[PDB]
Every structure is written in C-alpha cells, then in structure tokens.
Amino acid sequence: MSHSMRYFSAAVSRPGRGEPRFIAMGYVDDTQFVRFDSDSASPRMEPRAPWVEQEGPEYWEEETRNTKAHAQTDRMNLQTLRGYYNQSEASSHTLQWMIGCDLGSDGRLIRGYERYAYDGKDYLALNEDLRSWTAADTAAQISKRKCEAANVAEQRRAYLEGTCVEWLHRYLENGKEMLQRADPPKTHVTHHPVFDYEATLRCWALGFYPAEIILTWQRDGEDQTQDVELVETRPAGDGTFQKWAAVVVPSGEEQRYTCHVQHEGLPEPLMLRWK
C-alpha cells in the first residue's frame, strides 16, 4: 500500500484569445482532491474530494494565493521558453508541471519528484538525489543553470521532505475510508465462440481501487502477452477502475487457459478459468 501526493499544472497559450489558460490540481494516489482553473469566472483552488473540505479558510486562502502566483509564473515561463526556441507570438504552446512525493509502506518518503514538459517533451527534471537537475536539451540548460545559481534545489527538497510528506499523512488520515481502502476487483471470464474453430476469452476486472492492477492470460499455464489484447485501465465514473484482457483460443481448448489477477485488495492473487 504505497502512497503518493502529486500536484500538476498546465499552462496553454492561445494567442488572440486572451491570457494563457492555467489549470492546477492535486492528487492523493488516483483521487483528485483540489482544483484551480483560470477560466472558472472566479479562479480559486476548490475542493474535489469530501475529506479536504474540512480545511479552514486559511488553507484555502493560502492555496488559492500560491496557485495564482504559480499561474503568473508559468505564464512568464511560456514567454521565456518561446524566446529560447525562437517561436512566433502567433503560435500556441503547453507548459506542463508535476511535483510529488512517494512515502513507501513504511518508510517514509522513498521518492521526491519535480518535472516540467514543454509541448509534450521532457524539459527539466529534479534528479532523485533532489540536489541536481537533468535538462532535456540546450534551451533547458539555461533553466538548469539558473536553478543551480539560485540554489533552488534546496528549497524544493525542503517542500518534498517536509511539507509534502506531512500533508500526505494528514490527507490519508482525514480521507482514510476513501484513500486507504483497497476495493478488490469483481472478476469473471466471458466466452465468445466463432463456429466452430476458436473463441475469445475475455478476463474482466471491475470496480477496483486503486488503478494499479495486473491481468495476464496463461496456457498450461506458460503466459502469452503477444496475442493478448489488453485495454488501458479506465475510470468507471464512480471512483473505481476497470480493465480486461482477451485471448483467442482454439475451440474445445478453453479449460487449458487461466487468467491471473494481482491487485492490492486481493488476499492472495486470483486465478480464473471459463465455465
């Protein structure tokens, strides 16, 4: 039961349609708990999970204050990076950001993170040692040198080692029922004949939380990923996740295949077979 808190943001310029849009959002694991949107008509940091709504006005005032500061800083960063690449004022660009901490069963804090992406491309990252940066190209080297000279790593490390860890612990306690659950998947295998030579076996995992799951089909069983169709894990809409894994087998051959399911909410991992 590993846990993480992440803050993300996206600044998207739209020349000739106003200031760049800025969105920011915080997650614990796969649950969004906070959200800011500069297009809202009254931009502020807003609750997205019931357990954060018990924070008082000082918290919301400071989160809204800091996030507005970040919006303006990332709008400035869009301008700065447009120059580094010598791109035209008429063109649109995306600056994305991620900051976060991973705790570890115990503990605590196996990993801090901080990264920027520019137009979908890795730009600048804080290294695992949290004392040094990796820049993806020459433009980014300017940003890197600027962070080095201003000693910014130390300030990021202090948030990651201190504030990020402590508040993650707070949220995990306040939303214990939502966050420290482990809903196992409801699982079944469906059978889809093709007269009279083969059929498709589909292993379903449904209503599970968190997202991390592993489905695998095996014959005898000795495990074929190549012929397996595995969909991307998807949201149900009610907070839980879904996934399936399909394999086309020869007819009369179905009980030689078995589906393996591994997930935090399981006991003891699951083995399934069609009937």
Binding site: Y59, N66, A69, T73, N77, K146, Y159, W167
Partner: peptide, 9 residues
C-alpha cells in the same frame, strides 16, 4: 498542500 512557489525557468 502545494509548494510555496513555482520555478522560474
């Protein structure tokens, strides 16, 4: 709780 400032690039 988010960080106190963003990074100037």
């Amino acid at each position: 709780k988010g960080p106190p400032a963003a990074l100037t690039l």
